[PDB]
Design an enzyme around this catalytic site. Sequence first.
Site, PDB file in Angstrom:
ATOM      1  N   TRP A  79       0.807  -1.206   0.000  1.00 39.38           N
ATOM      2  CA  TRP A  79       0.000   0.000   0.000  1.00 39.38           C
ATOM      3  C   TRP A  79       0.842   1.259   0.000  1.00 39.38           C
ATOM      4  O   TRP A  79       0.310   2.328  -0.285  1.00 39.38           O
ATOM      5  CB  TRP A  79      -0.966   0.008   1.189  1.00 39.38           C
ATOM      6  CG  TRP A  79      -1.870  -1.164   1.186  1.00 39.38           C
ATOM      7  CD1 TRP A  79      -1.786  -2.271   1.986  1.00 39.38           C
ATOM      8  CD2 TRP A  79      -2.999  -1.377   0.323  1.00 39.38           C
ATOM      9  NE1 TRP A  79      -2.802  -3.157   1.684  1.00 39.38           N
ATOM     10  CE2 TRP A  79      -3.558  -2.632   0.668  1.00 39.38           C
ATOM     11  CE3 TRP A  79      -3.592  -0.628  -0.703  1.00 39.38           C
ATOM     12  CZ2 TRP A  79      -4.669  -3.158   0.019  1.00 39.38           C
ATOM     13  CZ3 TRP A  79      -4.706  -1.152  -1.345  1.00 39.38           C
ATOM     14  CH2 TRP A  79      -5.230  -2.411  -0.977  1.00 39.38           C
ATOM     15  N   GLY A 114      -7.343   6.681   3.882  1.00 37.14           N
ATOM     16  CA  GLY A 114      -7.718   7.456   5.042  1.00 37.14           C
ATOM     17  C   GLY A 114      -7.536   8.942   4.888  1.00 37.14           C
ATOM     18  O   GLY A 114      -7.406   9.639   5.896  1.00 37.14           O
ATOM     19  N   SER A 195     -12.813   2.980   0.112  1.00 43.36           N
ATOM     20  CA  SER A 195     -12.478   3.503   1.439  1.00 43.36           C
ATOM     21  C   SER A 195     -12.584   5.022   1.373  1.00 43.36           C
ATOM     22  O   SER A 195     -13.679   5.522   1.061  1.00 43.36           O
ATOM     23  CB  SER A 195     -11.124   2.923   1.839  1.00 43.36           C
ATOM     24  OG  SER A 195     -10.969   2.875   3.247  1.00 43.36           O
ATOM     25  N   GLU A 322     -14.379  -6.154   7.101  1.00 38.98           N
ATOM     26  CA  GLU A 322     -13.827  -4.809   7.016  1.00 38.98           C
ATOM     27  C   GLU A 322     -12.981  -4.455   8.227  1.00 38.98           C
ATOM     28  O   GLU A 322     -11.964  -3.760   8.097  1.00 38.98           O
ATOM     29  CB  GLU A 322     -14.950  -3.773   6.881  1.00 38.98           C
ATOM     30  CG  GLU A 322     -15.819  -3.877   5.668  1.00 38.98           C
ATOM     31  CD  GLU A 322     -15.127  -3.470   4.369  1.00 38.98           C
ATOM     32  OE1 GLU A 322     -15.812  -3.368   3.345  1.00 38.98           O
ATOM     33  OE2 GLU A 322     -13.906  -3.267   4.345  1.00 38.98           O
ATOM     34  N   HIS A 435     -10.667  -5.449   4.434  1.00 35.54           N
ATOM     35  CA  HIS A 435     -10.679  -4.117   3.850  1.00 35.54           C
ATOM     36  C   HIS A 435      -9.592  -4.005   2.788  1.00 35.54           C
ATOM     37  O   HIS A 435      -8.419  -4.291   3.051  1.00 35.54           O
ATOM     38  CB  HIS A 435     -10.438  -3.087   4.967  1.00 35.54           C
ATOM     39  CG  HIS A 435     -10.692  -1.664   4.566  1.00 35.54           C
ATOM     40  ND1 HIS A 435     -11.942  -1.197   4.210  1.00 35.54           N
ATOM     41  CD2 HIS A 435      -9.859  -0.604   4.477  1.00 35.54           C
ATOM     42  CE1 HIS A 435     -11.866   0.084   3.915  1.00 35.54           C
ATOM     43  NE2 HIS A 435     -10.616   0.472   4.083  1.00 35.54           N
TER      44      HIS A 435
HETATM   45  C1  LIG Z   1      -2.678   5.944   9.154  1.00 32.24           C
HETATM   46  N1  LIG Z   1      -3.473   4.807   8.661  1.00 32.24           N
HETATM   47  C2  LIG Z   1      -2.655   3.590   8.573  1.00 32.24           C
HETATM   48  C3  LIG Z   1      -3.558   2.402   8.277  1.00 32.24           C
HETATM   49  C4  LIG Z   1      -3.888   1.615   9.534  1.00 32.24           C
HETATM   50  C5  LIG Z   1      -4.871   0.502   9.165  1.00 32.24           C
HETATM   51  C6  LIG Z   1      -5.000   0.363   7.640  1.00 32.24           C
HETATM   52  N2  LIG Z   1      -3.658   0.301   7.021  1.00 32.24           N
HETATM   53  C7  LIG Z   1      -3.711   0.044   5.568  1.00 32.24           C
HETATM   54  C8  LIG Z   1      -4.128  -1.261   5.341  1.00 32.24           C
HETATM   55  C9  LIG Z   1      -3.393  -2.315   5.884  1.00 32.24           C
HETATM   56  C10 LIG Z   1      -3.815  -3.620   5.666  1.00 32.24           C
HETATM   57  C11 LIG Z   1      -4.958  -3.870   4.914  1.00 32.24           C
HETATM   58  C12 LIG Z   1      -5.699  -2.822   4.375  1.00 32.24           C
HETATM   59  C13 LIG Z   1      -5.282  -1.513   4.593  1.00 32.24           C
HETATM   60  C14 LIG Z   1      -2.868   1.513   7.277  1.00 32.24           C
HETATM   61  S1  LIG Z   1      -4.253   5.206   7.157  1.00 32.24           S
HETATM   62  O1  LIG Z   1      -3.846   6.650   6.847  1.00 32.24           O
HETATM   63  O2  LIG Z   1      -3.901   4.283   5.981  1.00 32.24           O
HETATM   64  C15 LIG Z   1      -5.998   5.189   7.455  1.00 32.24           C
HETATM   65  C16 LIG Z   1      -6.474   5.934   8.537  1.00 32.24           C
HETATM   66  C17 LIG Z   1      -7.828   5.976   8.826  1.00 32.24           C
HETATM   67  C18 LIG Z   1      -8.711   5.273   8.021  1.00 32.24           C
HETATM   68  C19 LIG Z   1     -10.065   5.324   8.320  1.00 32.24           C
HETATM   69  C20 LIG Z   1     -10.947   4.628   7.514  1.00 32.24           C
HETATM   70  C21 LIG Z   1     -10.484   3.889   6.427  1.00 32.24           C
HETATM   71  C22 LIG Z   1      -9.136   3.826   6.132  1.00 32.24           C
HETATM   72  C23 LIG Z   1      -8.239   4.523   6.936  1.00 32.24           C
HETATM   73  C24 LIG Z   1      -6.875   4.470   6.647  1.00 32.24           C
END
Ligand SMILES: CN(C[C@@H]1CCCN(Cc2ccccc2)C1)S(=O)(=O)c1ccc2ccccc2c1
Lengths: 525, 527
Positions: A79, A114, A195, A322, A435
């Site tokens: 990612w 996010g 997302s 999710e 997710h």
């Molecule tokens: C700082 N955040 C880091 C995230 C923490 C959990 C998700 N991963 C990515 C990820 C990993 C594995 C499988 C899929 C996805 C990194 S973020 O900026 O990416 C973030 C923040 C708040 C959000 C709220 C609503 C939806 C998505 C969000 C993402």
Amino acid sequence: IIIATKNGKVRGMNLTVFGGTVTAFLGIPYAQPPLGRLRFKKPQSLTKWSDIWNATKYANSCCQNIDQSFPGFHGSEMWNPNTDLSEDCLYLNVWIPAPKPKNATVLIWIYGGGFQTGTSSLHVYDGKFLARVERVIVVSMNYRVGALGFLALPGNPEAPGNMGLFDQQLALQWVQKNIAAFGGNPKSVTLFGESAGAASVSLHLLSPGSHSLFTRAILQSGSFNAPWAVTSLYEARNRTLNLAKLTGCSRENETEIIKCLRNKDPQEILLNEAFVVPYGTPLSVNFGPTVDGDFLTDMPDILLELGQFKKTQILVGVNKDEGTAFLVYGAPGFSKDNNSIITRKEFQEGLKIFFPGVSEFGKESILFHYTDWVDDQRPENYREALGDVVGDYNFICPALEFTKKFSEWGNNAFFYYFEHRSSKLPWPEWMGVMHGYEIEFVFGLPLERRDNYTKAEEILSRSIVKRWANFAKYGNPNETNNSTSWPVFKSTEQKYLTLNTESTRIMTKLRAQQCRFWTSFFPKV
Amino acid sequence: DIIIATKNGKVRGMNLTVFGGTVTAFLGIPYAQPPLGRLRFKKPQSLTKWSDIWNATKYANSCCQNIDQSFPGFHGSEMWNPNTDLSEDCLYLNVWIPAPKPKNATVLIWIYGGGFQTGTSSLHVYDGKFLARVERVIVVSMNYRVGALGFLALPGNPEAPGNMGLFDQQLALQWVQKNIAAFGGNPKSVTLFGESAGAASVSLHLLSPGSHSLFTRAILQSGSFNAPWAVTSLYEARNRTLNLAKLTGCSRENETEIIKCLRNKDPQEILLNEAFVVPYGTPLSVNFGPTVDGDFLTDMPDILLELGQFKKTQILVGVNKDEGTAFLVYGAPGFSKDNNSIITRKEFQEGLKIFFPGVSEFGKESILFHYTDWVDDQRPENYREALGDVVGDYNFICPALEFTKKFSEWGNNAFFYYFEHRSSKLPWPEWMGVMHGYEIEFVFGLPLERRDNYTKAEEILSRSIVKRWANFAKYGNPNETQNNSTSWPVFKSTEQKYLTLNTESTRIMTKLRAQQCRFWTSFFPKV
Ligand SMILES: CN(C[C@@H]1CCCN(Cc2ccccc2)C1)S(=O)(=O)c1ccc2ccccc2c1
Ligand SMILES: *[C@@H]1O[C@H](CO[C@@H]2O[C@@H](C)[C@@H](O)[C@@H](O)[C@@H]2O)[C@@H](O[C@@H]2O[C@H](CO)[C@@H](O)[C@H](O)[C@H]2NC(C)=O)[C@H](O)[C@H]1NC(C)=O
Ligand SMILES: *[C@@H]1O[C@H](CO[C@H]2O[C@@H](C)[C@@H](O)[C@@H](O)[C@@H]2O)[C@@H](O[C@@H]2O[C@H](CO)[C@@H](O)[C@H](O)[C@H]2NC(C)=O)[C@H](O)[C@H]1NC(C)=O
Ligand SMILES: *[C@H]1O[C@H](COC2O[C@@H](C)[C@@H](O)[C@@H](O)[C@@H]2O)[C@@H](O[C@@H]2O[C@H](CO)[C@@H](O)[C@H](O)[C@H]2NC(C)=O)[C@H](O)[C@H]1NC(C)=O
Ligand SMILES: CN(C[C@@H]1CCCN(Cc2ccccc2)C1)S(=O)(=O)c1ccc2ccccc2c1
Ligand SMILES: *[C@@H]1O[C@H](CO)[C@@H](O[C@@H]2O[C@H](CO)[C@@H](O)[C@H](O)[C@H]2NC(C)=O)[C@H](O)[C@H]1NC(C)=O
Ligand SMILES: *[C@@H]1O[C@H](CO)[C@@H](O[C@@H]2O[C@H](CO)[C@@H](O)[C@H](O)[C@H]2NC(C)=O)[C@H](O)[C@H]1NC(C)=O
Ligand SMILES: *[C@@H]1O[C@H](CO)[C@@H](O[C@H]2O[C@H](CO)[C@@H](O)[C@H](O)[C@H]2NC(C)=O)[C@H](O)[C@H]1NC(C)=O
Ligand SMILES: *[C@@H]1O[C@H](CO[C@@H]2O[C@@H](C)[C@@H](O)[C@@H](O)[C@@H]2O)[C@@H](O)[C@H](O)[C@H]1NC(C)=O
Ligand SMILES: *C1O[C@H](CO)[C@@H](O)[C@H](O)[C@H]1NC(C)=O
Ligand SMILES: *[C@@H]1O[C@H](CO)[C@@H](O)[C@H](O)[C@H]1NC(C)=O
Ligand SMILES: *[C@@H]1O[C@H](CO)[C@@H](O)[C@H](O)[C@H]1NC(C)=O
Ligand SMILES: *[C@@H]1O[C@H](CO)[C@@H](O)[C@H](O)[C@H]1NC(C)=O
Ligand SMILES: *[C@@H]1O[C@H](CO)[C@@H](O)[C@H](O)[C@H]1NC(C)=O
Ligand SMILES: *[C@@H]1O[C@H](CO)[C@@H](O)[C@H](O)[C@H]1NC(C)=O
Ligand SMILES: *[C@@H]1O[C@H](CO)[C@@H](O)[C@H](O)[C@H]1NC(C)=O
Ligand SMILES: *[C@H]1O[C@H](CO)[C@@H](O)[C@H](O)[C@H]1NC(C)=O
């Protein structure tokens, strides 16, 4: 080969895709670089270049913090940005079938992350398979994230908020004035995103400035009514002032605060965004969309209740688990390297991390509603309940509610429930259908048979690819004889289509008993 | 031929072969008029212009300084001794450039340490060719005056104003500004780094307004100005000047006859009496060092730091695990480099007298009490290690941590490190551990040379530190790669996160030695 855009000509690339050819333009600029005096402002339209731009490599990704929780791990590093970071990042990508079409429907991808992360050049967003197999034109854009994209001092054109949403909007304008020169139909364009990308797409439904710039919308695992999606003007001013303190930029005047902030090294903005919230959670959106009085003339829920939005067809859905991705970014007892069996106490501690401001009575009611075990033997009951708490509250239940209210205005809506877990998934089996892990099926990655997917995963990806492209072209996500017909989602029957390799059924009232809590009781604790 | 045209004349260099590539080296470029005769004890005078080609092909003279002859033939002590001839004519700098010539390279400028009384830029451990070769940075280093010839002070008197060694360093920085583009360097991407009194020097350049336009970023290894040894009060410096005049028969009624008298003394007559200007000294005595001169420093540096009056930029700071052990074999009872130095509780008490000469009997008892809560009562090694840690915490670790806190509170990104790897080739005994000054050979990439008998883990560790230092200079962030690397997080006064550096595991940790440092910050000043 060369195509002349209204601001100059660009040179593309030939891609050999499944025995055929796709023409790709990667890294077309669509706005002035938001540098120096343009940091924090809306995107400025581009003026013409006399040379020829070579849209032959993916461009810089926008400044953003990088997930480095799991160094070496594919499930997290896939990612992270895969081009250089830079404030010079307002570029988009165009993929075109060969031979050149003459009025191809356009699909425009808005990535998630996010509102803090993301980039259009990830492998799982490669639009070449979609162009090859369904003869659509695929477009994706980089838009500003974090405080560089969503820092808000409401009313001030120096830092008004929602700048990353206007980036996306300027890219959609580019498509309106240029996609014909490429063989695309500006009157048949469908937005899709996941997302925060999905939440972005749904906010384009509301914003009048975006009304004429697209036709239909697809919302994967997100919508603007989700609790993480919109920051109050209250919270946004508190966070802007906190970033000012953390960077040494507290002034007595708004415009001096931004003058100071415009002088900080980007990494001194980036590396402070985490502290602007006192009690964050793994779903914290430090700097996200606000009610700016420009992109959003009012607060999205009122715009949705009153029916002040673009009227069109929508395709909306969620995945089965999710919630589980966020459990390993904070909740105690959870790990990607073990089965994460937790006790009722650990479950209570995980509720604290995800619901910091909630009364002890409210957190007890969440617990109670999610512990009516059908088999009170299973050790993993609590691990599953906590993932379902996070997933229902943050994704599933808001998506259902958005689809209900949007449909009740005479709009054809289609809802899906994605339950297939990728055979290649780098994360453990307990996280299930995570997710983000329907995206590679939407983009046709399993059609590449030299890639270690299964045969059924190829068949599943091919139908999802086809249904998505058909919804773009025709407004109905149909497929070809032996294929389940997808019924419209309507307030009273609430019919949705399930997606998996075994059998794709039609069902009703998805998780209605869970969501009854989040809509009808939780708002009162 | 290897020729660059500088604003004072043309210079000729030499080609070096490093790791199958080339590094162009200009060694010994003059940057100031030689501070001879009537220029003794004055700020450095700017250079004129020569018509020849200056041959910058060997290291130049080291500045005058007493030598450390405590262990003849011992590599451990003698690798710090000057490796070129000594002379008052010593204001020269070195420049290492990557081949092929760069077009806008980032420049790292090294300021050596040595108690403000010793040191030289030509030591083997300060060789910039590896860094130039491997990270494509320009590396500059300068010789600056040390001891009384560098820091003698009668404040406000231009004949001996104070801080001349620091103005030397500054003049070299001015040279890089005026001249480094000609070599392929970006004068707008200049990082200072230094160790010990070199790191205290670097932090003073952050405080001194005349330095603010001469560099971009700073790196501080095992030192900072708030360390107890680093700055003399203005009138303690003036008193030592008069004791030195008295010790050499130069006591006079007016200051300028004192200086005129000192100017006719032989350098050796001055060096020979520098030890005697302090009544009682510790192994960490700085007889002649930085003072509040009203010019380079316009106030006591703790005030300027507290009031936020310093350059606002990014810093990288850190310390070693065993800063103190080096100083125990230079005066403490029971300590030898040739035995394992197991000492007693009474020897520990005499150790404290050595390092805290003017502290009350209760003060010395409280230091003892804070450092004797043993995990295991024996452990014969308890008191030996307690003393090293007392010395290490009070003089290096706790001040570096306090400077980083205070600096970061004003809004720039700071990064802290704890260096824990003992060099496999370290000539000192094992009980001394990760000593003061023994990260330097890793910062300059000496383990990257495989013909040199380092372990391969040390090559990987040095390769990583070289990369993080250079990335810090180029980007303000000491990152290694985006994937497959521990993120180095900013040091913030709440969480106080730091990165540990060693061959086993680089970890993110918090509140380094807070239980120890709380004594020195919150109890020892009340004693
Ligand atoms: C700082 N955040 C880091 C995230 C923490 C959990 C998700 N991963 C990515 C990820 C990993 C594995 C499988 C899929 C996805 C990194 S973020 O900026 O990416 C973030 C923040 C708040 C959000 C709220 C609503 C939806 C998505 C969000 C993402
Ligand atoms: C610096 O050195 C030169 C000699 O350099 C040699 O010749 C150079 C051209 C180059 O090839 C170097 O690598 C060699 O080491 C001194 O030279 C003058 O001119 C010629 C050069 O060969 C020489 O024969 C003369 O004797 C030199 N002039 C004098 C008066 O001796 C030059 O003087 C040196 N510079 C200084 C400041 O000492
Ligand atoms: C990924 O890189 C690791 C390097 O290990 C690390 O570097 C540290 C400074 C820190 O950033 C940390 O997070 C990071 O993981 C490579 O490492 C190791 O491999 C060597 C052999 O090449 C072994 O001798 C080590 O024991 C081993 N150390 C471990 C695993 O901790 C690793 O090979 C590399 N892997 C890939 C797939 O790129
Ligand atoms: C400044 O420092 C004086 C130190 O004087 C000394 O004589 C020097 C030649 C030198 O050798 C040094 O070792 C001596 O200490 C302070 O004066 C002190 O008071 C007496 C006066 O001669 C002297 O005998 C003492 O030995 C000395 N004090 C101590 C503790 O040794 C003087 O007080 C200091 N302060 C000021 C404001 O002058
Ligand atoms: C008079 N000093 C001689 C020193 C005494 C102990 C150190 N060795 C060098 C050395 C040996 C082994 C490992 C590392 C270094 C020689 S000094 O002038 O060099 C001196 C003075 C005060 C300082 C205060 C802070 C740090 C270093 C200092 C050095
Ligand atoms: C708005 O920002 C302020 C500034 O940090 C926040 O203030 C703190 O609130 C916590 C309680 O959660 C206290 O423990 C701290 O002492 C407060 N600090 C200061 C400096 O006042 C505040 O919580 C934020 N509020 C919202 C709603 O975001
Ligand atoms: C280390 O991190 C920095 C970010 O602080 C990276 O910097 C960008 O670096 C590229 C050079 O490859 C420049 O073109 C960009 O303009 C830089 N942008 C910013 C905002 O710093 C750097 O590339 C990283 N290096 C490694 C090896 O990972
Ligand atoms: C070397 O890099 C610097 C930037 O670090 C270049 O300077 C440019 O950016 C400066 C910002 O400090 C501004 O002053 C100017 O926009 C610009 N400077 C100019 C045009 O002189 C510098 O030019 C680079 N030199 C090279 C590449 O030779
Ligand atoms: C597909 O698989 C190929 C063979 O390899 C692997 O499976 C296990 C045994 C591990 O060795 C793992 O590293 C491999 O994935 C790979 O060479 C190829 O790169 C794989 N391709 C994709 C897209 O995953
Ligand atoms: C679906 O696509 C369009 C839109 O309804 C229609 O013309 C076509 O016949 C449909 N096909 C099937 C198999 O439903
Ligand atoms: C691929 O390459 C050429 C390059 O000009 C391009 O025009 C065309 O689409 C392809 N070539 C063919 C189809 O022969
Ligand atoms: C543009 O792309 C062509 C493709 O070969 C390349 O030859 C040329 O150098 C490029 N020039 C610019 C200015 O991008
Ligand atoms: C499709 O494209 C053609 C291209 O000429 C255009 O005339 C037509 O209006 C477009 N609209 C639709 C709805 O197909
Ligand atoms: C904000 O403060 C600065 C400080 O001098 C001033 O110059 C500027 O005009 C002020 N702007 C407003 C709108 O008050
Ligand atoms: C899983 O790993 C985490 C972190 O290593 C640990 O805290 C937790 O107790 C582990 N749980 C199980 C069931 O092993
Ligand atoms: C200096 O180095 C260059 C580049 O490697 C080389 O061409 C030249 O021969 C060298 N000149 C010497 C060694 O005098
Ligand atoms: C080692 O150091 C000196 C040797 O000169 C001596 O005073 C001390 O007692 C010795 N300690 C031992 C041998 O344990």
